[PDB]
């Protein structure tokens, strides 16, 4: 087609729709447990996606697991932004077809604040008019956007993969942004959106880990696979003991 084959591949490997299983009165705590229930199902889906993503299975298995444990929440908030942009024009948060939040369902002050943070992504998607082909290549680069302070075991292959998906994003931008000046500026805008996600996700990581270490008292359930990625890396990530990659100074 005019659509490059790697992008059409990324489109075919996107996860199908995941339901939260929410029991449809609204309450902050039961809402949070439903959000983490959904997060467990989405985590399964991200690891399956990774198994089909070109290049990723060839990195050392420890690097595969480290990059999923670093990037899971960033990938899931970026997909929440896509669904919300696409289904409700960014104006509600479309966590799943059975768990769509508007402002009436955001009652407790810290819950609404966290939603506003997440709401930044679909607002930028609406402003910039991000395309599916852009979003698919961006989402790979977010998987690949933090490494350990000592680097990865397959650092060479990693660097090759990340360059390949930067070239692919350039192709995605080229589908629509025809000028030299305009497609350069578009590359800048998209890559700076990805750099800015590191600071957005830090607030969600802190709230997550604070809730997780008193989850019993809070009556907030975290499922087993999500509890493992939290316990394995979150405190180290929050402490700054990882290397976030940036496109811009």
Tell me which residues touch ligand MOF (CB under 6 A).
32, 35-36, 38-39, 42, 73, 76-77, 80, 95, 111, 114-115, 204, 207-208, 211, 220
Q: What share of the chain is helix, strand, coil (3-state, %, to 5)?
A: 70, 5, 25
105 is in an annotated binding site: no
Site for a copy of itself in 181-240 (CB under 8 A): 202, 205-206, 209-210, 212-214, 230-231, 235-236, 238-240
- Report in angstroms how near the CB of residue 9 gets to ligand MOF at its nearest: 24
206 binds, among a copy of itself, ligand MOF, none (CB under 5 to 8 A by kind): a copy of itself
Number of residues this chain uses to bind a copy of itself (CB under 8 A): 16
Interacting residues of 185 by C-beta distance below 8 A, sequence separation 6+: none
User: What part of residues 165-184 is at the interface with a copy of itself (CB under 8 A)?
Assistant: none
C-alpha distance from residue 51 to each of 67, 159, 224 (Å): 13, 18, 21
- Give yes or no for a contact between 134 and 172, defined as CB atoms under 8 angstroms apart: yes
The two three-digit tokens of residue 237, written as one number: 């990530």
Answer for the pair 220, 32: CB distance below 8 angstroms, yes or no. Answer: yes
- Rounded CA gap, 80 and 73, in Å? 10
> With respect to ligand MOF, which residue has the nearer C-beta, 56 or 119?
119
Tell me which of a copy of itself, ligand MOF, none is bound by residue 141, counting a contact when its beta carbon lies within the kind-specific cut-off of 5 to 8 angstroms. Answer: none
* 151: nearest Cα among 59, 227, 234: 59
Q: How far is the CB of 36 from a copy of itself (least distance, A)?
A: 16
Binding residues for progesterone, as ranges, are 83
Site of interaction with a copy of itself (CB under 8 A): 202, 205-206, 209-210, 212-214, 230-231, 235-236, 238-241
């Amino acid at each position: 087609q005019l659509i490059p084959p790697l992008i059409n591949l990324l489109m075919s490997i996107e996860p199908d729709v995941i339901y939260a299983g929410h029991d449809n009165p609204d309450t902050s705590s039961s809402l949070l447990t439903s959000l983490n229930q959904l997060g467990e199902r989405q985590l399964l889906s991200v690891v399956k996606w990774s198994k089909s993503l070109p290049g990723f299975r060839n990195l050392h298995i420890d690097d595969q697991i480290t990059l999923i444990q670093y990037s899971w929440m960033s990938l899931m908030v970026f997909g929440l932004g896509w669904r919300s942009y696409k289904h409700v024009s960014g104006q509600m948060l479309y966590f799943a077809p059975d768990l769509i939040l508007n402002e009436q369902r955001m009652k407790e002050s810290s819950f609404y604040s966290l939603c506003l943070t997440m709401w930044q992504i679909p607002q930028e998607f609406v402003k910039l008019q991000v395309s599916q082909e852009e979003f698919l290549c961006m989402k790979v680069l977010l998987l690949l956007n933090t490494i350990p302070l000592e680097g990865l075991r397959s650092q060479t292959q990693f660097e090759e993969m990340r360059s390949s998906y930067i070239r692919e994003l350039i192709k995605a931008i080229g589908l629509r942004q025809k000028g030299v000046v305009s497609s350069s500026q578009r590359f800048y805008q998209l890559t700076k959106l990805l750099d800015n996600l590191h600071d957005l996700v830090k607030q969600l990581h802190l709230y997550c880990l604070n809730t997780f270490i008193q989850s019993r008292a809070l009556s907030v359930e975290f499922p087993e696979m999500m509890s493992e990625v939290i316990a394995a890396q979150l405190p180290k990530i929050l402490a700054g003991m990882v290397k976030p990659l940036l496109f811009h100074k």
